[PDB]
Structure formats: structure tokens, C-alpha cells
Amino acid sequence: PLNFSRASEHRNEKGERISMINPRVVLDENGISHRSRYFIMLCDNETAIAHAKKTSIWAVKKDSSKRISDAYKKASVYFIFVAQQTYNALGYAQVVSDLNSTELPFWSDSSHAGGVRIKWIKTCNLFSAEISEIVSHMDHGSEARDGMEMMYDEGSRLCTLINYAIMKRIGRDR
RNA sequence: UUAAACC
């Protein structure tokens, strides 16, 4: 079972922090991998998520746009989509363009900085108690804030849990 | 709906 209480204590022989799931993955002092970075999208709008599952365009919020665009410079960047009120996992996707003002989804509003293209990896409408728990403690033990970056081990565990449910025919949406 | 990466 994953426990972050001692995550800072997982270290290699050089003193670098390493992942609790895969000890070969070197992390910064925030638990983030320079190679693979994960952001949560807390979805409150059925129209937006259904349109994004069809068209693969997402609107990024002003408050998280700079950090996401900076992460896209040298890492693979993933968005994990979670329904805000129920914490159902809706899927996860890789960001395959940077922020731009040329291609916006029609549902974007003044909260959004611009658009990105995504490539869906899995889609679902899934309840999992461990996904719920990870989202509920993502901000230092308190609930995730929309657009926040999470730790490598949180992103990787969420992808594993989504994949596992889909392969068991649980929470599929297609 | 075969995560990616690392091995």
C-alpha cells in the first residue's frame, strides 16, 4: 500500500529522492519526476468533458497555465480527469500541444488562459475508493485543488488504478 | 481503452 508519510525518506545512494513505486525514477524534493509530470483536472461541467472526449481539446485555467506550459518544455505531461463532486475518474490523457490561443473549445470562458490538444490514453466513469482517497489527500492531506500538479507516485498510481478497473470491465464508458 | 518512462 502507498504511504506518503515516509516518501521523503526514499533515497538512492547519492541522496536523491526516488519513487516508492519504481526506485529507478529520480524525483525532486517535491516528489516530481522531471520526465513525466501529472496534473489533476477537476471537472464540474458535463458538456466540457463530453466535448473533450470527442474532440481531444481542453481549455487550461489561468491559475495553472504557466506551470503546465513550463512542464511541457522538457517532460511528458499528463492530465488526470476527475469529477469534482463525486471523484469519479473520467480518464487520463497526454498533452500533445502547448498552450495556444488559436484552438479553443467553444465552452472556454474567462477563467481559461488558452487551449491544449490532448491524446486520450484511457476514458472511463469510474468509482474507486483508492482513487477517491488519493484525490482527497492530494494537497498535503487535504482535497486536490483544480489544476494542481501531483507527485509522480500519485500520478502513476492513479494511472495503474484506472487501467486495472478498465481491464476488469469496471467503469468503462465505451 | 495493452499507460508512458526506467529496467
Residue numbers in the entry: 315 to 488
Give verbatim lines from the article.
Mmi1 is an essential RNA-binding protein in the fission yeast Schizosaccharomyces pombe that eliminates meiotic transcripts during normal vegetative growth. A C-terminal YTH RNA-binding domain in Mmi1 recognizes UNAAAC motifs (where N is any ribonucleotide) that are present in multiple copies within DSRs. Surprisingly, Mmi1 binds DSR RNA using a divergent mechanism on a surface that is distinct from the m6A-binding pocket, including extended protein sequences located upstream and downstream of the YTH domain. We propose that the low-complexity region influences RNA binding indirectly by reducing dynamic motions of the RNA-binding groove and stabilizing a conformation of the YTH domain that binds to RNA with high affinity.
We were not successful in crystallizing the USR–YTH construct itself, but removal of an additional 19 residues from the N terminus allowed us to crystallize Mmi1 residues 301–488 bound to a 7-mer DSR RNA (UUAAACC). We determined its X-ray crystal structure to 1.4 Å resolution and built an atomic model for residues 315–488 and all seven nucleotides. The core YTH domain of our structure of Mmi1-RNA is similar to apo-Mmi1 and to previously reported structures with a central five-stranded β-sheet surrounded by four α-helices. Part of the N-terminal USR region of the polypeptide, which was line broadened in NMR spectra (making structural analysis of this region impossible by NMR), was ordered in the crystal structure and folds back to contact the back of the YTH domain. This results in a network of hydrophobic interactions involving residues Leu-316, Phe-318, and His-324 of the USR, Met-334 and Ile-335 from the N-clamp, and Met-465 and Arg-471 from the YTH domain. In summary, our structure shows that part of the low-complexity USR of Mmi1 (residues 315–326) lacks secondary structure elements but adopts a defined fold on RNA binding, forming contacts with the YTH domain. DSR RNA was bound in a pseudo-helical conformation in a groove generated by the central β-sheet and the C-terminal α-helix using both positively-charged and hydrophobic surfaces. Residues N- and C-terminal to the annotated YTH domain contact the 3′ and 5′ ends of the UNAAAC motif, respectively. Examination of relative B-factors from our crystal structures suggests that the final C-terminal helix is relatively rigid when bound to RNA. Residues 301–311 of the USR are not visible in our crystal structure, and signals from most of this region are line broadened in NMR experiments.
